[PDB]
Amino acid sequence: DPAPRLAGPPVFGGPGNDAFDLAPVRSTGREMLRFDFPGVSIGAAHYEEGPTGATVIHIPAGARTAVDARGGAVGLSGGYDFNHAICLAGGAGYGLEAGAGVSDALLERLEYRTGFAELQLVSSAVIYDFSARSTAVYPDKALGRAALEFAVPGEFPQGRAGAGMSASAGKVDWDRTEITGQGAAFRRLGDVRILAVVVPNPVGVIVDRAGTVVRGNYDAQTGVRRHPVFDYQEAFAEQVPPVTEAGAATISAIVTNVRMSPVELNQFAKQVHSSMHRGIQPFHTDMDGDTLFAVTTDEIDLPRLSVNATALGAIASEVMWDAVLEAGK
Amino acid sequence: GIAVDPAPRLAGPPVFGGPGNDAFDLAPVRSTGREMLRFDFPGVSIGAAHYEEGPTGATVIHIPAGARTAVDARGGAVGLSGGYDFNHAICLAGGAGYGLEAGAGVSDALLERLEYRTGFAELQLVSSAVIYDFSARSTAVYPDKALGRAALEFAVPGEFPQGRAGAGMSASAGKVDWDRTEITGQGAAFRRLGDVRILAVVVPNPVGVIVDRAGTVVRGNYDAQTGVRRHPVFDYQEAFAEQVPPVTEAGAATISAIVTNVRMSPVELNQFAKQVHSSMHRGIQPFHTDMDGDTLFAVTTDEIDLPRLSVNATALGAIASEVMWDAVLEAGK
Numbered sequence: 001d002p003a004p005r006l007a008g009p010p011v012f013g014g015p016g017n018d019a020f021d022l023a024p025v026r027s028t029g030r031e032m033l034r035f036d037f038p039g040v041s042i043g044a045a046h047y048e049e050g051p052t053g054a055t056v057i058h059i060p061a062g063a064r065t066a067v068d069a070r071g072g073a074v075g076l077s078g079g080y081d082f083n084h085a086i087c088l089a090g091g092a093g094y095g096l097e098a099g100a101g102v103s104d105a106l107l108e109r110l111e112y113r114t115g116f117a118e119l120q121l122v123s124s125a126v127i128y129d130f131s132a133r134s135t136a137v138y139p140d141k142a143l144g145r146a147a148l149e150f151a152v153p154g155e156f157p158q159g160r161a162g163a164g165m166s167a168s169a170g171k172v173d174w175d176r177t178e179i180t181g182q183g184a185a186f187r188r189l190g191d192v193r194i195l196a197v198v199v200p201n202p203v204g205v206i207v208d209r210a211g212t213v214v215r216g217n218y219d220a221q222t223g224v225r226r227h228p229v230f231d232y233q234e235a236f237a238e239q240v241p242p243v244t245e246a247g248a249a250t251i252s253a254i255v256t257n258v259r260m261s262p263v264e265l266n267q268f269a270k271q272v273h274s275s276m277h278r279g280i281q282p283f284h285t286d287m288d289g290d291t292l293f294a295v296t297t298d299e300i301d302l303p304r305l306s307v308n309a310t311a312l313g314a315i316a317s318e319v320m321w322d323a324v325l326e327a328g329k
Numbered sequence: 330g331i332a333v334d335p336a337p338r339l340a341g342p343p344v345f346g347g348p349g350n351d352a353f354d355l356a357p358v359r360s361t362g363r364e365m366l367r368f369d370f371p372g373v374s375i376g377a378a379h380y381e382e383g384p385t386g387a388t389v390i391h392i393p394a395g396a397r398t399a400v401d402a403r404g405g406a407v408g409l410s411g412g413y414d415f416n417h418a419i420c421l422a423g424g425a426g427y428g429l430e431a432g433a434g435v436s437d438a439l440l441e442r443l444e445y446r447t448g449f450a451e452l453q454l455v456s457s458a459v460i461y462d463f464s465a466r467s468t469a470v471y472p473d474k475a476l477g478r479a480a481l482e483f484a485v486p487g488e489f490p491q492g493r494a495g496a497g498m499s500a501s502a503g504k505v506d507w508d509r510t511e512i513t514g515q516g517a518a519f520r521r522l523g524d525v526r527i528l529a530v531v532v533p534n535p536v537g538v539i540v541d542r543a544g545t546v547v548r549g550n551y552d553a554q555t556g557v558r559r560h561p562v563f564d565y566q567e568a569f570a571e572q573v574p575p576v577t578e579a580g581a582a583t584i585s586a587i588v589t590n591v592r593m594s595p596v597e598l599n600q601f602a603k604q605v606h607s608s609m610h611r612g613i614q615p616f617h618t619d620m621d622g623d624t625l626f627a628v629t630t631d632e633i634d635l636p637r638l639s640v641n642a643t644a645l646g647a648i649a650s651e652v653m654w655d656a657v658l659e660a661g662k
């Protein structure tokens with residue numbers, strides 16, 4: 001095990017946002033991760049009517065960011081090299097609207113100042129979560145605003161919370177797809193802080209450090225999860241078309257306090273994002289919209305090629321794997 | 330054959346401390362601009378809406394079939410949402426990053442039109458790009474969901490409102506010194522050659538100036554003390570010669586689309602996009618600077634085949650480059 005969480009087949013023709021007086025709910029998930037990271041707040045809100053949600057990482061001072069987008073199905077807004085917030089949401093491309101709610105709320109907080117240096121920058125990424133439920137409800141401006149309003153320092157709701165409400169893994173065949181969640185992990189090493197946040201909605205499965213498939217591609221007929229490569233290789237061996245459902249992505253953030261140059265931060269982002277092919281397999285496929293944000297608060301100076309980015313990247317890769325395993329738990 | 334008005338239209342300094350959207354009962358206005366371009370391209374509609382209280386607006390290109398797209402983004406200040414390789418609409422808007430919300434209004438309206446079908450193949454894909462237009466007016470009003478929805482609702486086949494209309498309402502050029510910045514507009518141009526159709530749409534909000542085919546600066550960097558415009562390079566070279574810091578204001582971009590009916594592979598379409606986008610350094614100078622958020626969408630409706638390197642993309646790119654220069658001059662007229 002763990003116990004199966006099959007998504008089950010969606011019921012088509014379900015209601016959308018116009019059918020409801022949508023009430024934002026503060027997401028608490030299955031448990032709260034507590035950590036110490038001054039200047040970073042996290043909020044998560046959902047609509048039970050979906051169920052679908054949004055998770056917002058708010059860094060009020062603004063933070064330098066690198067964006068690494070992979071796959072054929074990325075859903076991204078802004079992708080800025082400097083952000084006051086990162087907004088992760090369900091609802092496919094429709095859920096990018098949640099980031100507009102964050103942006104608008106930040107503008108209002110700044111008393112509608114619009115000097116170029118005062119622009120409030122929100123980058124948003126989405127997962128397609130419509131197959132995992134029987135409604136067309138999407139995260140909207142009101143839900144992004146709610147997630148920001150619910151944001152507090154040093155807390156993250158694990159599991160079915162915010163953007164993770166209806167995330168799912170293992171999409172060779174929808175009959176074997178399982179609900180994941182969102183996950184976070186945190187490490188402090190001296191003054192160095194690393195926070196990983198992930199919403200895995202992959203076509204692939206979640207894999208632990210022993211190589212065990214722990215979430216996704218669960219066959220009710222056998223009681224066992226299978227690495228998708230075994231399904232693909234048997235399709236090719238039998239000379240029949242392989243199958244896989246569209247509507248997949250993993251959207252993620254690494255937040256650190258270590259000062260990194262733009263080149264270091266971008267190389268760091270690419271290394272950490274590639275590392276996730278250990279815990280999610282396959283990963284970075286044409287079916288996926290994989291988007292990682294690497295964010296630094298530029299607080300700590302560590303003592304032409306960067307050993308510091310490489311070493312920090314290796315550690316952050318482990319924090320991110322732990323976050324993926326929390327999402328699949 | 331575009332007769333650009335020599336008369337200055339300096340933006341002037343803003344009055345700031347201006348209020349935001351909810352301070353107003355905002356009614357979308359259908360933008361008519363100074364003149365309507367009429368063109369024959371079935372399957373392509375354009376809508377333009379503005380708020381007088383900005384003034385600011387959005388321009389939406391609606392292609393209900395969906396169309397293969399290449400995005401070419403240059404500079405350090407791009408404001409882009411979606412950037413999809415297949416789009417049902419392109420939304421160009423003011424309001425800097427806040428104006429990307431207009432595209433959410435278009436997306437939501439299209440989802441409602443599809444009766445909330447959400448199959449992956451049924452997703453309604455809208456790519457949005459923005460200009461910073463807050464220095465050209467006082468209010469913090471931005472294109473919002475309602476304005477994007479209005480622009481989509483106002484979309485008319487085969488028409489485009491030239492000038493101060495939609496996203497072009499508060500576009501401006503020539504930002505070495507804001508005292509010399511002039512209002513531009515939005516512009517479009519269209520050519521048919523045999524069965525080939527090319528539509529260019531542009532919203533030039535550049536740090537640079539608009540330049541005609543004779544090399545004359547026709548919009549931006551107008552010095553009211555001398556009654557003439559000149560190329561920004563004169564300002565930059567004088568700064569370096571005097572050993573003082575150069576100056577240039579932030580908040581600049583040119584956002585554009587080239588729509589054609591010629592079938593092109595993804596590789597051809599991306600190469601075509603890069604060629605046409607680079608070509609715009611002829612009509613906008615400087616261009617593709619770190620101060621700019623330049624974003625071009627190259628869209629094909631994949632209707633006609635022309636009879637490893639693409640002569641067709643190169644030839645079509647050369648002609649589209651001229652259509653785009655005409656569109657830039659319509660914006661500056």
Ligand code: NA
Pocket residue numbers: 113114115118345
């Ligand atoms: Na200001």
Ligand code: NA
Pocket residue numbers: 012446447448451
């Ligand atoms: Na459907």
Ligand code: NA
Pocket residue numbers: 394395396630631632
């Ligand atoms: Na077509």
